[PDB]
Amino acid sequence: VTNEEIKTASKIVRRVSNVEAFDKSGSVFKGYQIWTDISPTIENDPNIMFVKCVVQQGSKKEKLTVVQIDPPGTGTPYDIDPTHAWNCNSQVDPMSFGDIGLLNHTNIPCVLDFLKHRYLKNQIYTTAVPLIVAINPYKDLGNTTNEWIRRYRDTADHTKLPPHVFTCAREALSNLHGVNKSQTIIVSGESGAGKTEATKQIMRYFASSKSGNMDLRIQTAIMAANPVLEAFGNAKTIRNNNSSRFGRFMQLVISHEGGIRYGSVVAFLLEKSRIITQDDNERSYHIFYQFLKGANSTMKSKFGLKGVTEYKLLNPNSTEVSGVDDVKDFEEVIESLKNMELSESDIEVIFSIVAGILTLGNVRLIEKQEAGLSDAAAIMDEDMGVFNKACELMYLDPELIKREILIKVTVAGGTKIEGRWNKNDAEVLKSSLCKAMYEKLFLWIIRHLNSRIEPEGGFKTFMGMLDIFGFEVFKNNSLEQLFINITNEMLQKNFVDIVFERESKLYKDEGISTAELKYTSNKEVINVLCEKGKSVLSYLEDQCLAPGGTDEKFVSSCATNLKENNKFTPAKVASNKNFIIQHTIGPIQYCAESFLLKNKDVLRGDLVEVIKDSPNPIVQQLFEGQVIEKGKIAKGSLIGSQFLNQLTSLMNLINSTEPHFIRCIKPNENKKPLEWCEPKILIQLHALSILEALVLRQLGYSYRRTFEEFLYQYKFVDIAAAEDSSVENQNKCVNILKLSGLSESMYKIGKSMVFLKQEGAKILTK
Amino acid sequence: DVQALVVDNGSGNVKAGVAGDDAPRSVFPSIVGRPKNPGIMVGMEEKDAFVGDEAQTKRGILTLKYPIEHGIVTNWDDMEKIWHHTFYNELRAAPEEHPVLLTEAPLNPKGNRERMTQIMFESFNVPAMYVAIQAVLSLYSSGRTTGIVLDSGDGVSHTVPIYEGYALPHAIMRLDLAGRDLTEYLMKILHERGYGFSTSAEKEIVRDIKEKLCYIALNFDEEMKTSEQSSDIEKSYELPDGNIITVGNERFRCPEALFQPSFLGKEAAGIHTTTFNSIKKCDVDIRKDLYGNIVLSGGTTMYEGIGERLTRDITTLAPSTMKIKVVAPPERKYSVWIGGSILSSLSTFQQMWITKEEYDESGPSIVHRKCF
Amino acid sequence: DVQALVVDNGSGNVKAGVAGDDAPRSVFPSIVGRPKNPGIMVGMEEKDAFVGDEAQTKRGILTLKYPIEHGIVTNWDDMEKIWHHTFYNELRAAPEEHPVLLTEAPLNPKGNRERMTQIMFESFNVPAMYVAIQAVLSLYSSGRTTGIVLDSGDGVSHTVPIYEGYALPHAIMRLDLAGRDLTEYLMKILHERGYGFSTSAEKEIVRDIKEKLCYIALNFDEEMKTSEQSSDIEKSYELPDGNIITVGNERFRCPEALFQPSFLGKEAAGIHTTTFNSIKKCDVDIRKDLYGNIVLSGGTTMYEGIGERLTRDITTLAPSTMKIKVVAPPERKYSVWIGGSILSSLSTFQQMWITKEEYDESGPSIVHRKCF
Amino acid sequence: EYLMKILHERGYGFSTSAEKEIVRDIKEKLCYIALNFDEEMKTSEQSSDIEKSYELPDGNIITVGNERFRCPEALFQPSFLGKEAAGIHTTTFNSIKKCDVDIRKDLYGNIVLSGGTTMYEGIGERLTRDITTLAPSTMKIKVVAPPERKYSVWIGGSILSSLSTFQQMWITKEEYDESGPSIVHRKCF
Ligand SMILES: C/C1=C\[C@H](C)C[C@H](C)OC(=O)C[C@H](c2ccc(O)cc2)NC(=O)[C@@H](Cc2c(Br)[nH]c3ccccc23)N(C)C(=O)[C@H](C)NC(=O)[C@@H](C)C1
Ligand SMILES: C/C1=C\[C@H](C)C[C@H](C)OC(=O)C[C@H](c2ccc(O)cc2)NC(=O)[C@@H](Cc2c(Br)[nH]c3ccccc23)N(C)C(=O)[C@H](C)NC(=O)[C@@H](C)C1
Ligand SMILES: C/C1=C\[C@H](C)C[C@H](C)OC(=O)C[C@H](c2ccc(O)cc2)NC(=O)[C@@H](Cc2c(Br)[nH]c3ccccc23)N(C)C(=O)[C@H](C)NC(=O)[C@@H](C)C1
Ligand SMILES: Nc1ncnc2c1ncn2[C@@H]1O[C@H](COP(=O)(O)OP(=O)(O)O)[C@@H](O)[C@H]1O
Ligand SMILES: Nc1ncnc2c1ncn2[C@@H]1O[C@H](COP(=O)(O)OP(=O)(O)O)[C@@H](O)[C@H]1O
Ligand SMILES: [Mg+2]
Ligand SMILES: [Mg+2]
């Protein structure tokens, strides 16, 4: 572990509820337990952030004298401040239930220790209704046996079973077959927290029906492509080595009582800016490196490839990663391409296209004093051969590409005028060509794979499995992290809407008024980020269009115009380059450096038409279907607008169906099972907005219990109305309530349950 | 969302289009013609005023008039005719649904833009309006924030310097000498060969001769001397009805009156002195960045060899260590319109329109507050 | 452990850094500029005050002002702007985590340092603060405990004698004649050749001319006489825009006003008499050790040939058996900052800060007790 | 030149060198100095008694409004015409403040106007009111504007040259023949 995670985790910690147990009017203690952050073991064990202390009998109100017990580091009492003491949970058991919104005191160390306790006994699933938390145990729990599937499917009672991914799977199947409504599973977690396992288990549960089988050709076909996908859509970051840079989606159509009939794969939000420039400590997508290293001699002679450190699109100072071999994966991806019905000619074409991209990425452009301009563009003579090569490997005409890169044709009222680009615009056009070729090749591969398992009646009511990521809460943020946070803000809006609807329904069913449940909305930050005219992206576009635009002007214009609302705020140190946005999970800081260079992307209709007329059929199929529009300025083609369009499409697709949520968590980095690192797990609890969900539950009546458990827990508080054994449970419960002294604004008696505020349950404990 | 309409109307042509494109949709001359003969056949259009391109195909019957002279509107009924024809017949888009971005020249009277605003808000009913300056849009369309713009069209020739987005209003210069004066000077000096053009419909033939055959000489005296030794200077031109005329010296003596206005009886300085006198009214620190970006614009700057003459003539006036750099883009005839479209398609700009409520509560003078 | 911030702000430049280094990290002029023209392009920074090095690259557009004159702050809002820019943008270190060592000149009013303290403790929230004197730090940075320091910067010229660590406060002398007066005197006497510099942004060009071409003559009358016999005294200088100017006598007549203030209409004594009159106010026993250590400091003491002139002029005033010894280190432009860093990085010094509790219980006047 | 420039706002264009004289005559006939510039600019939008008419050499009639008191105002606010300098009321006060504290009371009492550009109507009152606001409260400002201040330099020169003490200060021809043209730097102040 490093110290930056320690700083971040320590900065996440909050403080609200005060300490107690001076009841009633003296200084007596009941062996009271608290949580504190000052201990000799804390400054020694980096994996520990809190310790459970017992306050000694006879301590004073001003300063607390405590002796820690968890872990038992010493016995000598020392003094701590009353502000470094969080409450604990001593009258509760983490195995008597799965829900967390029922605990009396909910804070950071309480939830941390709750999860730790449940996890250490190989109980990795937990519930935060309607959330389902899961943890990666780095081994097998024996939950993939058909016995578990049949137990969770056939048993008519499932709501009184331990939490499992099969809970979501069963609820989805039930709501799908009962009423004609599609369902969606959203697996949101890090790229190492075991999401593929959850997807595979959900698909296996789906496969087995009362007449269904275990394995299906759809499964092995989809798994015959994960090498290809993770070779083309994954890259090495600084906090991971196999990070997924796009949203994967799967539409499954299943018969009534059979297996999985058909399926389709869709990719969303692929990051195009990485293909051109990466950070100093990261790499591009894997396919470049693994193809360049693993290619045989015939390719290295036919294509003309060179070393990894000899290309402009590839960061030379960081090309090697230890956990990856970068050779055998090339054979793996070749075999995965062969398994999906691709001849050798197609493989040759695809790798020629990629080599042509890499080659075109090396052409250099110079300026000239001609055509009446000061900075007319031109190709350097030394690369005039190289350029030609880059046009052969793509099966394109070199002269027409030169014409569309270096020449600008304006059609006036009734005349053609032949201008010329400068150097910056020519380089932008070249880079746009590279990025577009790459993304369209990827989409064509996805379509060719989908062609095998295509449904023909279309998708009218289907099953969905979306694989997405979480927030980016570190300190070195850029444009990509901004896009990610925007996506997660949209998802948060959707989640809050679903939760409010379900809770309103629940309150309506148990005979309770619903004119008191009010939830907070994040429409202000969404308006600050993505509205048209007044938002960050609109001003980024303005700076990309206006003459002589820079990043500092962008930050200044944002600071001047968005000053109306409190969601935008400029930084303190170096305030002309950084800014701060108040997201729903807290403030995040961005560094507006190289925003313009990474937002410019211009593709014109003339180039599309030149490409569609290639002799090769695959290149003809590359850009087909895409409509063109010529005679315009680039006011809707920049990366921000493409991103907003894709996000709109995805949010429409999700808003069609009904969602279910799942969160994956990794406990440590060394992959060893049954470990714990409280900083690294608190960071992920913060990112995935789990704490935000908990805070959202605490509005309304978060303590929902049936009469049985309510009496079981509060049998000692009231004796005069518990052992009468002559009246209904509702009557004895309302008598207990009227005897306890809680006002109506703190409780509700449901028709089959009881509902309590958080303050109510905090009072009734003592 | 709705787009704006960009209408750049000069003294000659009219450029009109929708905000977002990269070239004007409709370009047509701004003339109004009226028939001077009686119509005798029944069943024909008894129209009494032809506007635009129609008044140009049948110019042999009509008397042509321009409603704008020297950038100032001298007849407002004809201007309303031109605007009506532009909105409804050329763009085919009612103005009551889009905002309009108009354009004016610097150092004009105020009644001009006040009446323009009143007409736009009362005769038509636009939701919003704005009035820009041509030499600024011509720089918007170039990807620069520093430079001096020399705009020369049909009525006015003006220079406007700008340094990193800041205007220097005390160094703006205006010169009432443009393409129309060159047309009249050519029509006058063609008499020396025996060709007499007098009517308003024969001015267009002279204008076409000027556009086809005239060029700018690098050294005027050497050129005048080497043209008396041979006859390879002469060119021929065929009139509409079949005659053939021949022109000699007049090919490089007509545009030379841009550098020596005393040829046509004016007491003023050429475009090479007006440009240098406008740099010398700026602070000594910012003069090196203006010598590096001299942007040509308008249509009268399209003669063959004007950049070389301008460079050689400013280099002789500036110090010896400066780097003069004249920028003449090949589509500099529509730079003002392209710049206007770029400007009107910005998100920061949508707070600078003159909405209808402000006009209803403040009157036509509002343009003097919100528009530079 | 945490380091202190050393901020030496004079009338001209500002030297800032962290305590421990051997040279200031950021050096930049202390000016505040404001635009005098209207901005016309959309999408540009609508800033209303440029500070430091940014207000110097675009000085052709702005009006420049200095917030400190003669060592006394005349405008406190601009000074807060300068300090904010220094802490957050230049050093990039919040002041709420480090102590600050400021610097002042001797014989200043008391409201100056009282307001300085109030601003440091209220606007920013520093944990501790201290205010030193420049001529003492200039001696700290020299490895001596005995000597007389002649400090001359941009606003004030003062002499301070010290004998084995004991200050002699009755012999401190101050003289309001420094580099800015020499700039103005050069700007005035350049009119005799036909060069007129008037604006605030043309004062910087004159200052650069002075730094590049001026020197000090060993014998003024002989130099003035031998310069009328030839023209090898003259030098050339190229302005920002390309012109060439030539200077003659003005090369050694501008700094000569340090030794004869009556040139610029002041009734005072030169720096060679102020230094000798400050030794003669010390006891007869300690005068021989001051004649041996005359330390030059500040930037105005960087002319070519000032040590020789100063030695020859003090030798003529002192007795015949003394050994005059002027010490002019080659980096004497940053001696005050180096001395301040040395001082603030001592273990004995950490008991002399003005902590925040003392200010909270005693008010801003506390600086008069703890600081000399 | 500033009047010739701001007359464009009414539609009058003077450009040639022989039309500068007409503008100069307009300026001499119709312009005056306002005591309070902002109050004057405000009270001129309520009526039309500010306007005057002027007949050109050939018979046309032009009318001027604000331009009557906006042209000379650029003496007190040079930034109107794009200069970075101080008005004549600040240049005068900054020149007294460079004299010794003992002689400042006798300069506040004799401020002599001269030249032709000081002949606008109401310049003494504006100058007095603007220097009184800069000087201490107990001083007595006294601006002296003689009615023939357009020829004061010539009258003074005649008085000086008609003195008997002065006849020893001429630069005779022998001194020039033996010393060259630089002699003027010795004998003339
Ligand atoms: C130029 C045109 C046709 C041309 C006849 C085409 C042919 C090819 O040129 C000639 O034949 C040259 C010839 C001519 C040439 C040399 C010469 O020593 C004498 C005459 N010139 C003439 O006959 C003049 C006589 C003239 C009238 Br009356 N007033 C004028 C005012 C000023 C100058 C001259 C004149 N002439 C008949 C015209 O200008 C007529 C009015 N011009 C036109 O209708 C225009 C629309 C087309
Ligand atoms: C010095 C500079 C450029 C210079 C022109 C560079 C060139 C190279 O020097 C000359 O050409 C010398 C020439 C001159 C030289 C000798 C002579 O017997 C008469 C004139 N001097 C002039 O023309 C004077 C006339 C003048 C104005 Br108006 N008021 C003034 C106040 C006091 C003194 C003189 C004047 N002139 C135009 C300036 O000073 C202008 C204002 N100066 C500048 O813009 C500065 C920023 C740069
Ligand atoms: C001022 C004079 C006469 C006047 C005609 C006397 C009469 C009485 O005033 C008018 O008729 C006002 C009228 C006018 C008024 C209001 C208006 O909304 C539009 C026009 N102005 C005009 O027609 C302008 C048009 C114009 C030319 Br072209 N370039 C210019 C540059 C800047 C501004 C305007 C223009 N016009 C013809 C002139 O300036 C001519 C050059 N001026 C002269 O010869 C001087 C010597 C005498
Ligand atoms: N090729 C050319 N050579 C010379 N002059 C031209 C050429 N094309 C157009 N012109 C001139 O340009 C003038 C109109 O230019 P333009 O700027 O388009 O109109 P406006 O001045 O109304 O903006 C016409 O008077 C015409 O004489
Ligand atoms: N090489 C040089 N020759 C002459 N003068 C100089 C030179 N370098 C700097 N100066 C003068 O030094 C002055 C500023 O000196 P400095 O002591 O650094 O600032 P401050 O006076 O604010 O402490 C400037 O006015 C400048 O004129
Ligand atoms: Mg035009
Ligand atoms: Mg100093």
Author numbering:
A (entry chain AP1): 3 to 768
B (entry chain CP1), C (entry chain EP1): 5 to 376
D (entry chain BP1): 188 to 376
In the authors' words:
By picking well-decorated filaments from the micrographs, we determined the malaria parasite actomyosin structure using helical reconstruction methods to an overall resolution of 3.1 Å, as estimated by Fourier shell correlation with the 0.143 threshold criterion. As typical for actomyosin cryo-EM structures, the resolution of the Act1:MyoA:ELC:MTIP structure decays radially away from the helical axis, having a well-resolved core, consisting of the actin filament and the myosin motor domain, whereas density for the MyoA neck region is weaker, but nevertheless allowed us to locate density for the light chains, ELC and MTIP. The Asp544 side chain of MyoA forms hydrogen bonds with the backbone amine of Thr352 in Act1 and the side-chain or backbone amine of Ser351.
The mosquito-borne parasites (Plasmodium spp.) that cause the disease depend upon an unconventional actomyosin motor for both gliding motility and host cell invasion.
